[PDB]
Design a protein around this ligand. Sequence first.
Ligand SMILES: [C-]#[N+][C@@H]1[C@@H]2c3c([nH]c4ccccc34)C(C)(C)[C@H]2CC[C@@]1(C)CC
Ligand SMILES: O=C(O)CCC(=O)C(=O)O
Ligand SMILES: [Fe+2]
Length: 267
Amino acid sequence: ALHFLDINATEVKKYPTAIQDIIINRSFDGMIIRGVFPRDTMEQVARCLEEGNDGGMKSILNKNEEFGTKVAQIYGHAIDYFASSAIFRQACRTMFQGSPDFEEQVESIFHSLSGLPVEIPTGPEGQTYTPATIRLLLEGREIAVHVDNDAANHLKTLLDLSDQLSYFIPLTVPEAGGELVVYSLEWNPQEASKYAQMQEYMDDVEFKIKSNQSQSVAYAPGPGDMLLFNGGRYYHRVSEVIGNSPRRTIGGFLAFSKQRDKIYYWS
Ligand SMILES: [C-]#[N+][C@@H]1[C@@H]2c3c([nH]c4ccccc34)C(C)(C)[C@H]2CC[C@@]1(C)CC
Ligand SMILES: O=C(O)CCC(=O)C(=O)O
Ligand SMILES: [Fe+2]
């Protein structure tokens, strides 16, 4: 049983315990927030990436050449890391041009849905984590089915009570495909231990998926819509992009602090 909400960005203050409801109470599993950013800004940022005037973001683009087809090209280092984080935050700041700003708008959303302070995690001696990364899926590319379970790690000491949500906003969407499919099949450490390697386990997960033994919801958010769901708990994939226009998303993760007195968001 998978249950999602679908609200407008203006409605977020009708749901001040949504992040609690998903993570702690587990009363529902995700939501779509329509028009978090404007179409103007999303297209503006996409142009900056396409044209090359991207505040030095191309410098931190990982093409992931040797893991072909079922992975994405990614701007920034996903969890040297601390360097790219600084370049990203600066670059991202440049393109959005505070109209509105990425970090300020996003933190406003997570705050409206929790009533808790929202901060980007910090390193041992003050190094910022990257709040997000930009994922680039070209024609013919997808993201293979996976779960976002648990540096290893400074973060752990700030967090962990005890599910992590995933979030993202499309900058650009493809013609067809590029759909988030979320399955009811969950991460289970007891199921995984049954196999000698993760290769064998993921083959059975794939089997269980293709045998249609699980429920699956599919979402294709439009530019500026945020998808916020329980990626650490449920297996999910982004379907194969169709047509020339790439899928570009800017996304990350979030979780409650150790004391549940904060919300941290990063990528
Ligand atoms: C795409 N992508 C990221 C993850 C990723 C995977 N495999 C990789 C190999 C080399 C570099 C990154 C990945 C998986 C399939 C776990 C991808 C999940 C989604 C990611 C954006 C997570 C940071
Ligand atoms: O499409 C994206 O940006 C990432 C999708 C995903 O797997 C996630 O948000 O956890
Ligand atoms: Fe994911």
